[PDB]
Amino acid sequence: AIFQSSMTK
Amino acid sequence: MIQRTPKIQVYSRHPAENGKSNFLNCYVSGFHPSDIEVDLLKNGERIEKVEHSDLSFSKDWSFYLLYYTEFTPTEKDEYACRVNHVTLSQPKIVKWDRDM
Amino acid sequence: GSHSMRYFFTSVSRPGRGEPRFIAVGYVDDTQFVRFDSDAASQRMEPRAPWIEQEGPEYWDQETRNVKAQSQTDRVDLGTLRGYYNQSEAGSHTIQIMYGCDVGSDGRFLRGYRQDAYDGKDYIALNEDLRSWTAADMAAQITKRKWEAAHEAEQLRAYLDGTCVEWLRRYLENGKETLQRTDPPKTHMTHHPISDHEATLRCWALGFYPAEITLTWQRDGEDQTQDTELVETRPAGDGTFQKWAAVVVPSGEEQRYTCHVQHEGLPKPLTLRW
């Protein structure tokens, strides 16, 4: 399962 | 960013046996950017039914793709891969060679 | 043996032609199992291996939700990075992301990683300690300060050495017949004269898995790297891989040359000689 908490750069 | 030209291999899934069904692969790798077209040709004519893998990329960020179709190799028949990419002044055609 | 789970994300901007193209793929070792294509009709994470198909509706909802979220993050970053590099709205640009975790033959965490790139070049990477970052340029140093401030490393680490491992362990079992296999290389040699003076020896490795393999030529025990022609390891299309290495040898001296094959599926390294 993929990472659930992507954060902008 | 200086754009990267694709490496191209044309080959079969199994050792070639004239008259026996097989799969023809064109593996394109090391290219950037990702936009690209790949076609497989039988005696200069583009094969209608061809599939490819989902876009992925390598350690160095260059992309790779596999295109493939069913084919029955013979002695007379000629096969090739045609790659169309922004780094290529004209589409690059690579002939299939059975033990390359 | 040891195993890895990795996800790959590519976002390509298409100025004037709508939202960026977004493609995600997931692998366990060298076996792909899911994909998402922003241009496809379903707008769902899709299965790409038989053994993942058994996951229920809650799984596909979760992956679909989260993969869309990833695309929206990356879409916004394309704008941000374009600004960071003072680039025009007109050109197409690419963000690539890879992350994943490794476990040992005991299912325990070995290491975790994440690297991000812009236009095919390193942007920012998580360090091995999973606590700090390496920024490749002045733009990425801005991202770095932002992520340090937001404690992003801690969140990603919780995934890399936690949930990533748990899922990987589950996949390894559900996909056991496919994933916990090692197909050793079927090896052979070919030989063709090129003139009265020289001949080509090609060492073949076929139908092996995983893709990791090493082919080396020696001459009377001396490493021949490289009067050696070595192709990239390539997919056969049936879940196995191929590779060959060739040398051009003096006519009649083939006996001096040995091909050495190393692969996880081989109890001992092989030596081939014509």
What's the gap in Å between the CA of C212 and the closest CA on chain A? 24
Residues of C in contact with B65 (CB under 8 A): none
Residues of C in contact with A1 (CB under 8 A): 59, 62-63, 66, 163, 167
Whether C234 and B27 lie within 8 Å, measured CB to CB: yes
- Alpha carbon dihedral C178, C179, C182, C188, in 10-degree steps, equals 60
What residues pair up with B64 in beta bridges, in sequence order?
B29, B56
C56-62 contacts, C-beta under 8 A, 24 or more apart: C59/A1, C62/A1
Q: What residue numbers bound the domain in which B20 lies?
A: 1-100
Residues of A in contact with C165 (CB under 8 A): none
Residues making up the annotated binding site of C for a peptide antigen are: 7, 73, 84, 116, 143, 146, 159, 171
What residues pair up with C37 in beta bridges, in sequence order?
C23
Contact C257, C174 (CB under 8 A): no
Closest residue on chain B to C191 (Cα)? B99
Closest residue on chain A to C141 (Cα)? A9
Compute CA C216 distance to the chain's CA centroid, rounded to the nearest angstrom.
Answer: 22
Supply the CATH number for residue B86's domain.
Answer: 2.60.40.10
The count of domains in chain B is: 1
Question: Nearest 5°: phi and psi at C61?
Answer: -65, -50
Using the CB atoms, write b or e for B76-87: b if 16+ within 10 Å: eeebbbbbebee
- Compute the distance between CA of residue B82 and CA of residue C76 in angstroms, rounded to an integer: 35
Question: Nearest 5°: phi and psi at C254?
Answer: -60, -25
What residues pair up with C26 in beta bridges, in sequence order?
C7, C34
- Compute the distance between CA of residue C105 and CA of residue C244 in angstroms, rounded to an integer: 29
Contact B25, B13 (CB under 8 A): yes
Identity of the residue numbered C265 = G
- Compute the distance between CA of residue C36 and CA of residue C30 in angstroms, rounded to an integer: 18
β-strands B7-12, B22-31: how paired? Answer: antiparallel
Contact C27, C98 (CB under 8 A): no
What's the gap in Å between the CA of A5 and the closest CA on chain C? 8
Domain parsing of chain C, residue ranges: 1-181, 182-274
**CATH of range C182-274; options 2.60.40.10, 1.20.1280.290, 2.60.120.1360, 3.40.30.10:** 2.60.40.10
Whether C92 and B33 lie within 8 Å, measured CB to CB: yes
Q: Which fold has domain C1-181?
A: 3.30.500
Q: Please state the three-class secondary structure of B38-75 as a single string.
A: EEEEECCEECCCCEECCCEECCCCCEEEEEEEEECCCC
Number of neighbours of residue C232 by Cβ within 10 angstroms: 13
